[PDB]
Design a protein around this ligand. Structure first.
Ligand code: SF4
Ligand SMILES: [Mg+2]
Ligand SMILES: [Mg+2]
Ligand SMILES: [Mg+2]
Ligand SMILES: [Mg+2]
Ligand SMILES: [Mg+2]
Ligand SMILES: [Mg+2]
Ligand SMILES: [Mg+2]
Ligand SMILES: [Mg+2]
Ligand SMILES: [Mg+2]
Ligand SMILES: [Mg+2]
Ligand SMILES: [Mg+2]
Ligand SMILES: [Mg+2]
Ligand SMILES: [Mg+2]
Ligand SMILES: [Mg+2]
Ligand SMILES: [Mg+2]
Ligand SMILES: [Mg+2]
Ligand SMILES: [Mg+2]
Ligand SMILES: [Mg+2]
Ligand SMILES: [Mg+2]
Ligand SMILES: [Mg+2]
Ligand SMILES: [Mg+2]
Ligand SMILES: [Mg+2]
Ligand SMILES: [Mg+2]
Ligand SMILES: [Mg+2]
Ligand SMILES: [Mg+2]
Ligand SMILES: [Mg+2]
Ligand SMILES: [Mg+2]
Ligand SMILES: [Mg+2]
Ligand SMILES: [Mg+2]
Ligand SMILES: [Mg+2]
Ligand SMILES: [Mg+2]
Ligand SMILES: [Mg+2]
Ligand SMILES: [Mg+2]
Ligand SMILES: [Mg+2]
Ligand SMILES: [Mg+2]
Ligand SMILES: [Mg+2]
Ligand SMILES: [Mg+2]
Ligand SMILES: [Mg+2]
Ligand SMILES: [Mg+2]
Ligand SMILES: [Mg+2]
Ligand SMILES: [Mg+2]
Ligand SMILES: [Mg+2]
Ligand SMILES: [Mg+2]
Ligand SMILES: [Mg+2]
Ligand SMILES: [Mg+2]
Ligand SMILES: [Mg+2]
Ligand SMILES: [Mg+2]
Ligand SMILES: [Mg+2]
Ligand SMILES: [Mg+2]
Ligand SMILES: [Mg+2]
Ligand SMILES: [Mg+2]
Ligand SMILES: [Mg+2]
Ligand SMILES: [Mg+2]
Ligand SMILES: [Mg+2]
Ligand SMILES: [Mg+2]
Ligand SMILES: [Mg+2]
Ligand SMILES: [Mg+2]
Ligand SMILES: [Mg+2]
Ligand SMILES: [Mg+2]
Ligand SMILES: [Mg+2]
Ligand SMILES: [Mg+2]
Ligand SMILES: [Mg+2]
Ligand SMILES: [Mg+2]
Ligand SMILES: [Mg+2]
Ligand SMILES: [Mg+2]
Ligand SMILES: [Mg+2]
Ligand SMILES: [Mg+2]
Ligand SMILES: [Mg+2]
Ligand SMILES: [Mg+2]
Ligand SMILES: [Mg+2]
Ligand SMILES: [Mg+2]
Ligand SMILES: [Mg+2]
Ligand SMILES: [Mg+2]
Ligand SMILES: [Mg+2]
Ligand SMILES: [Mg+2]
Ligand SMILES: [Mg+2]
Ligand SMILES: [Mg+2]
Ligand SMILES: [Mg+2]
Ligand SMILES: [Mg+2]
Ligand SMILES: [Mg+2]
Ligand SMILES: [Mg+2]
Ligand SMILES: [Mg+2]
Ligand SMILES: [Mg+2]
Ligand SMILES: [Mg+2]
Ligand SMILES: [Mg+2]
Ligand SMILES: [Mg+2]
Ligand SMILES: [Mg+2]
Ligand SMILES: [Mg+2]
Ligand SMILES: [Mg+2]
Ligand SMILES: [Mg+2]
Ligand SMILES: [Mg+2]
Ligand SMILES: [Mg+2]
Ligand SMILES: [Mg+2]
Ligand SMILES: [Mg+2]
Lengths: 137, 99, 82, 122, 96, 208
RNA sequence: GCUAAUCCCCCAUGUGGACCCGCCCCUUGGGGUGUGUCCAAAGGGCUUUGCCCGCUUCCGGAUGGGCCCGCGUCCCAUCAGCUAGUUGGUGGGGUAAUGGCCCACCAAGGCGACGACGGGUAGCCGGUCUGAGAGGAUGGCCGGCCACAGGGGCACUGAGACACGGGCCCCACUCCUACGGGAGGCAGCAGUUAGGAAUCUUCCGCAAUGGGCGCAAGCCUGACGGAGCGACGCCGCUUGGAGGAAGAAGCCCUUCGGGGUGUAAACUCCUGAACCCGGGACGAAACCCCCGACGAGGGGACUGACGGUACCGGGGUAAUAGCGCCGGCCAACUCCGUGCCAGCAGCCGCGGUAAUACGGAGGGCGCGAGCGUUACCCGGAUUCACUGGGCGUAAAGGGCGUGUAGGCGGCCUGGGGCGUCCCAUGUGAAAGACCACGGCUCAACCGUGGGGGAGCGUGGGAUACGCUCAGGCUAGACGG
RNA sequence: CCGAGGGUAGGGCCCGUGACUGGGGCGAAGUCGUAACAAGGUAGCUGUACCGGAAGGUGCGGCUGGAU
């Protein structure tokens, strides 16, 4: 497996699209810190470190909207959109002045900085940049 | 300051001179990705103390000969023949790129 | 010598000099060492003269040589007052 | 392509192919006429289009259109040419400028006169 | 068809003479002393070597030698003579 | 220079009265009053649906035709507005307004801007004292726009000065008859003018 | 053959400076010291036992340079191998100085898919143009650097040149002549000719700014300041304004009733470009002269090419409009003529007897001392796609493996801090652009202030992620 | 000694041109047939090979992107 991060986000995107309550992703002290942001900002209900066949995972509790009126009652997503920015194929790094404004404020950019994993908003606050991990809304 | 660079010695076959290979990374000015580029410097070694495989630092210096404008600053590591392999094997592949 | 003099900017029938320190061997309107003030000979504004005085005294100490018609605009700003 | 591939091979800026080579980068070029005759257009048109073969200051010899109704061009007629093909006469890629050198303006143009080198009337 | 550039060429020819003549001598002497110093013959080497050094610095007064040339010619002159007398010694005058 | 020809055909093509003459503009001898249909052979033919392009051309031309201004000069202002802070549409109208010849006609010294030019051009107008004969002078707030002294005694300006005694002048302007002098107070809010122009459609013309 | 000097030389003098050897600090040849040796000079002038300008050796400043190094700098791989002064060494030559820059000897090295070598094209930058940006294209004018001076080579003089209007030599070409012999180098300003689609006056002045020489007066300055030509560009301005018929003539259309041109014209009145007359600049206050001290400081005067021009005043004439287009894209429609002809055309397409598409006409649309065409650049073109595309059938998966370089890589802990991120600081010239203001009656143009930046150097910090080193693990992989 | 260049000799790359010749594009108002598109009247296409005025044919093997 070549990108653990991209893998996680996709495990999520894929599940959210058939409306699973949760999904398991292989555990990591870096992936968690990202989940810590996904939950805090209310994209997920949250996560808990579980175990499958002796091996550490992160069970991720997914969140959606109301049932709907019309022929397609499938609720709206909370995570409509999540995608790698930086990648192993091309590391993407921004300085503070060039951190993007996701979706006109309504979305976030998680980034990894030397002050930990932050959002665009938070990064601007401590005034640091870093590897732009991804974008969510 | 006098520019200082670090690299592997790939040749000791000159008298009082070593070929030191210095490597560097930088993002592609358009495609972003971090890319490596390398370069050989003829470094002055009056003492013939530097061996093949040494990792060393070299400091820009007043010109010693045509092409030699660096003296060897100091030893850093010894016995990196694995680096020397990477270079030597690459040159050996060149016999296979011709016609 | 290095010189203090008058580089003409502005335009036709509309002079506007920059009193400036430059090498004598430069062309008039060429790269100068340092700007130190300006001078509107047509006097068309309230300060048709400005001169950093603190600076012009330095260059003189260090050997700069002003032109005649620059020596004056240094008198008029009293760079010379003893 | 992958990003690495692009680092490796780059993208290719595609060059343009001039459509008026005989001009050798000039706005116009002077010439002399060799053959001055009529040509028949391709389907679906039918006519007798007026054409001059012109030998250039730029080394080249080309067929150029003679616009207007009627002309005074014959062998040895000196002529200035401009660019622009005539879609229906393949190989013709240039126009003779009326009103220049031995190419007379059109007798009795009233409309669009500048394009035909016809002076203003009384 | 005229100029005082002519004048300036007229002069260069004359300065050229005085220069070349001066430089000739320096080499004649330096080599003379170096020759002596080889077969040294120490007093004489040193004697001529002084006559050189004098003439060198004399040349450095004007356009003939830039000061650093004079320095350099002197430096190499002396080094040669001394190290030559090392193959037999010993310094009979000055110097030094 | 500027348009300088039959000026009633302008209104008829525009489908609206533009007050390009002055007096006869208010009479029933006005062209729009008699033939409120486009000049020339086909004016009475049933108009067919104008295209979008068509529409924005007219709104632009109409605004332009009002000021008697050349298309370049019009452009250069607009572009100026596009670089200048704020809502371009407002600022554009504002800058169109600050033209000497317009200011003069707004302060009533003339019956038509077309007459307000020849006044400025013939130096009968001045600003802050000094004479100005430039129909394009960009008037700023605070300026005193007066009739020339040597022109105060003139038949036509008299007749025209007599006509303003109590007709009220826009909120951005003050006027002192007898003193023959007016004053430029501020740039017009859009409401301060009510020209038959959706100025937005003008922006839309220049973004193609 | 003779004669002068700030020309040349000789000795003396030594603050100093140079050089060899030793020593101390440093640390590439930096600073000091001891012995030895070696090197200075030119006087002119006035108000004349005192000034001024020169002359000499040294130190430091300033300014301008040389050399060196990191990174950046186009097309072709149908150019894949290149290299003998080649790569390094030792000694020496040379220079201001390092260096194969040059030589002698020794060693066998140096370079190249990260694209050497070769071919092609190009002076590079500040900038410019376009573009939402990213990018693309470009390097004219202005500023910075480089290179060159008919084509080559060379050195001399000199602080500095291997010297555009200096020298030597060879070549090509032209000219002069008295036919023996000589001359020249506009890629300085104008100007001629050739070439070309095409690009200026053999003008004026040193008044201003600047430069050279001079104690200074001052002399020279095709730098420059201005004037001339050209709609080449941008900016400004004019050919008028108001009033004026249910609306002439003419011309165009028509259902023959009328509709259009058109308030357009006439005509009436108001203004007043041009043109006349008078006056008339800013740019110029220094240098010098005065007293003071030849300084600080205060007064004297000279001087303007542009130019009797701008501009101010007074008088005063209604006074140039053209060009493209009107099938769709695209804003603008009818009549005649023509009849797959003559012709139009950017693409699609028009024309074969009722053509809004040809030609004329009336009318209309668009711009206006301009309009249009041709050429070229970016745009639309996410149609080379980083931003921002694609590959079952549209163009596009290698015939399949194996595998070199490379690119990329699981979980946990530490060390380092290369990428990365932050702070400080230097640099990031001037002009241009951007925001403010201000001067030419506006503008264009121009001036004063402001705002920054990427990117590189330096110092300090952070350590999530990528890297690197080190120690663990078993979910990948491999083995039993 | 080196040295502009000149001379002798042999090489490499590129441009122009050349009796004649090979196909190609186009035009179109012709001659000859009718190979493909329908089961296109022998399913088609295919690499290769031999052959025929010409499209083409046949052999071998492959593909369906073949009608019934
Ligand atoms: S009369 Fe006044 S308003 Fe009516 S048309 Fe003529 S100008 Fe326009
Ligand atoms: Mg991206
Ligand atoms: Mg060496
Ligand atoms: Mg046809
Ligand atoms: Mg010819
Ligand atoms: Mg036409
Ligand atoms: Mg002289
Ligand atoms: Mg001799
Ligand atoms: Mg000297
Ligand atoms: Mg010399
Ligand atoms: Mg104009
Ligand atoms: Mg609309
Ligand atoms: Mg705006
Ligand atoms: Mg109105
Ligand atoms: Mg109104
Ligand atoms: Mg636009
Ligand atoms: Mg004598
Ligand atoms: Mg002496
Ligand atoms: Mg050798
Ligand atoms: Mg050496
Ligand atoms: Mg030298
Ligand atoms: Mg060499
Ligand atoms: Mg490399
Ligand atoms: Mg390549
Ligand atoms: Mg070439
Ligand atoms: Mg070139
Ligand atoms: Mg774009
Ligand atoms: Mg270029
Ligand atoms: Mg150019
Ligand atoms: Mg330049
Ligand atoms: Mg040359
Ligand atoms: Mg030469
Ligand atoms: Mg020449
Ligand atoms: Mg020559
Ligand atoms: Mg010279
Ligand atoms: Mg020369
Ligand atoms: Mg040179
Ligand atoms: Mg020169
Ligand atoms: Mg010359
Ligand atoms: Mg004779
Ligand atoms: Mg002779
Ligand atoms: Mg001559
Ligand atoms: Mg010609
Ligand atoms: Mg000329
Ligand atoms: Mg000129
Ligand atoms: Mg002068
Ligand atoms: Mg002067
Ligand atoms: Mg002097
Ligand atoms: Mg002159
Ligand atoms: Mg009627
Ligand atoms: Mg009527
Ligand atoms: Mg009529
Ligand atoms: Mg009628
Ligand atoms: Mg009228
Ligand atoms: Mg004056
Ligand atoms: Mg048009
Ligand atoms: Mg259009
Ligand atoms: Mg239309
Ligand atoms: Mg006919
Ligand atoms: Mg007809
Ligand atoms: Mg048309
Ligand atoms: Mg027509
Ligand atoms: Mg568009
Ligand atoms: Mg693009
Ligand atoms: Mg294009
Ligand atoms: Mg992409
Ligand atoms: Mg596509
Ligand atoms: Mg296909
Ligand atoms: Mg396959
Ligand atoms: Mg194969
Ligand atoms: Mg590998
Ligand atoms: Mg790796
Ligand atoms: Mg990892
Ligand atoms: Mg680590
Ligand atoms: Mg770091
Ligand atoms: Mg910075
Ligand atoms: Mg700047
Ligand atoms: Mg102003
Ligand atoms: Mg500025
Ligand atoms: Mg900016
Ligand atoms: Mg760490
Ligand atoms: Mg490990
Ligand atoms: Mg396993
Ligand atoms: Mg030779
Ligand atoms: Mg030769
Ligand atoms: Mg010869
Ligand atoms: Mg042929
Ligand atoms: Mg043939
Ligand atoms: Mg068949
Ligand atoms: Mg068939
Ligand atoms: Mg068949
Ligand atoms: Mg077959
Ligand atoms: Mg047959
Ligand atoms: Mg057969
Ligand atoms: Mg098969």
């Amino acid at each position: 497996l070549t990108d653990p991060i991209a893998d996680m986000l996709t495990r999520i995107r894929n599940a959210t699209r058939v409306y699973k309550e949760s999904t398991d992703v292989p555990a990591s002290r870096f992936k968690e810190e990202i989940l810590r942001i996904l939950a805090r900002e209310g994209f997920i209900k949250g996560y808990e470190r579980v175990d499958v066949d002796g091996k550490p995972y992160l069970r991720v509790y997914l969140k959606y909207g109301p049932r709907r009126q019309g022929p397609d009652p499938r609720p709206e997503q909370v995570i409509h959109h999540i995608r790698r920015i930086s990648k192993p194929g091309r590391r993407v790094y921004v300085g503070v002045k060039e951190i993007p404004r996701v979706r006109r404020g309504l979305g976030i950019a998680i980034l990894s900085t030397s002050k930990g994993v932050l959002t665009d908003r938070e990064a601007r606050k401590l005034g640091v940049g870093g590897e732009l991990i991804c974008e969510v809304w | 300051p006098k520019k200082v660079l670090t690299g592997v010695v790939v040749s000791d076959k000159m008298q009082k001179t070593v070929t030191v290979l210095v490597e560097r990374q930088f993002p592609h000015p358009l495609y972003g990705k971090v890319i490596k580029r390398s370069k050989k410097y003829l470094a002055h070694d009056p003492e013939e103390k530097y061996k093949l495989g040494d990792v060393v630092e070299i400091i820009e210096s007043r010109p010693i000969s045509k092409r030699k404008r660096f003296r060897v600053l100091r030893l850093v590591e010894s016995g990196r023949m694995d680096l020397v392999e990477k270079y030597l094997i690459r040159r050996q592949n060149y016999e296979s790129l011709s016609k | 010598m290095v010189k203090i003099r008058l580089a003409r900017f502005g335009s036709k029938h509309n002079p506007h000099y920059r009193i400036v320190v430059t090498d004598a061997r430069r062309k008039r309107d060429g790269k100068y060492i340092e700007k130190i003030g300006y001078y509107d000979p047509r006097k068309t504004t309230p300060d048709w003269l400005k001169v950093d005085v603190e600076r012009a005294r330095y260059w003189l100490s260090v050997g700069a040589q002003p032109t005649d018609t620059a020596r004056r605009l240094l008198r008029q700003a009293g760079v010379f007052r003893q | 392509p992958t990003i690495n591939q692009l680092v490796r091979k780059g993208r290719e800026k595609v060059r343009k192919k001039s459509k008026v080579p005989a001009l050798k980068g000039a706005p116009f070029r002077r010439g002399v006429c060799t053959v001055v005759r009529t040509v028949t257009p391709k389907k679906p048109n039918s006519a007798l289009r007026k054409v001059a073969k012109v030998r250039l200051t730029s080394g080249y010899e080309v067929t150029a259109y003679i616009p207007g109704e009627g002309h005074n061009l014959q062998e040895h007629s000196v002529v200035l040419i401009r660019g622009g093909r005539v879609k229906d006469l393949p190989g013709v890629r240039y126009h003779i400028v009326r009103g220049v050198y031995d190419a007379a303006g059109v007798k009795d143009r009233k409309k669009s006169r500048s394009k035909y080198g016809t002076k203003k009337p009384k | 068809r005229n100029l005082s550039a002519l004048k300036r060429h007229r002069q260069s020819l004359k300065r050229r003479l005085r220069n070349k003549a001066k430089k000739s001598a320096i080499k004649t002497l330096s080599k003379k002393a170096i020759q002596l110093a080889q077969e040294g013959k120490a007093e004489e080497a040193l004697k001529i070597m002084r006559k050189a050094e004098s003439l060198i610095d004399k040349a450095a007064k004007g356009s003939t030698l830039h000061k650093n040339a004079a320095a350099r010619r002197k430096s190499r002159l002396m080094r040669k003579v001394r190290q030559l007398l090392e193959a037999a010694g010993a310094p009979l005058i000055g110097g030094g | 220079g500027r348009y300088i020809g039959p000026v009633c055909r302008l209104c008829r093509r525009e489908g609206v009265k533009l007050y390009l003459k002055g007096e006869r503009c208010y009479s029933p001898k006005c062209a729009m009053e008699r033939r409120p249909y486009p000049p020339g052979q086909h004016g009475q033919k049933r108009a067919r649906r104008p295209s979008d392009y068509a529409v924005r051309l007219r709104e632009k031309q109409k605004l332009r035709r009002i000021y008697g201004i050349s298309e370049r000069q019009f452009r250069n202002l607009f572009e100026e507005a596009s670089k200048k802070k704020g809502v371009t549409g407002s600022v554009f109208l504002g800058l169109l307004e600050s033209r000497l010849d317009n200011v003069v006609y707004r302060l009533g010294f003339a019956v038509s801007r077309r007459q307000a030019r020849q006044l400025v051009r013939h130096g009968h107008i001045t600003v802050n004292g000094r004479r100005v004969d430039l129909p394009s002078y960009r008037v700023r707030p605070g300026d005193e726009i007066a009739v020339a002294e040597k022109s105060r005694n003139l038949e036509l300006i008299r007749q025209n000065l007599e006509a303003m005694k109590g007709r009220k002048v826009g909120p951005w302007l003050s006027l002192d008859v007898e003193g023959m002098k007016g004053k430029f107070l501020r740039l017009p809010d859009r409401e301060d003018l009510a020209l038959p122009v959706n100025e937005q459609l003008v922006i839309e013309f220049y973004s193609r």
